[PDB]
């Protein structure tokens, strides 16, 4: 149990938790950007 008291003068831990909160965003924007247009394809098919 050498872990936080002096060891985080280094890197490694550093970015992780930030990216947990950030990566969430990257996924859901991409997922919607996949699904969306091709929903409008089958909506536009109907409308006409």
């Amino acid at each position: 149990k050498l872990y936080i008291k002096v060891k985080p003068l280094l890197t490694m831990a550093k970015v992780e938790d930030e990216l947990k909160a950030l990566e969430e965003k990257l996924k859901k924007a991409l997922e919607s950007l996949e699904k969306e247009e091709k929903v409008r394809k089958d909506i536009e098919v109907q409308n006409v």
């Binding site: 089958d42 098919v45 109907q46 006409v48």
Partner: protein, 49 residues
């Protein structure tokens, strides 16, 4: 007709008329009359067209 409805497109058409009759036999009845009474009018649409 159900299997073959235009599954979501702009329902645009042609109409083909297929009425099978104008049959001459000694027996013609009311059956032959309700049919041959379309056939007459198709022949009339020939004049009219």
């Amino acid at each position: 007709n159900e299997t073959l409805d235009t599954k979501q497109k702009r329902q645009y058409f042609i109409g083909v008329l297929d009425i099978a009759g104008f049959e001459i036999f000694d027996y013609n009845g009311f059956e032959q009359l309700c049919i041959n009474f379309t056939n007459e009018k198709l022949q009339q649409f020939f004049n009219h067209h």
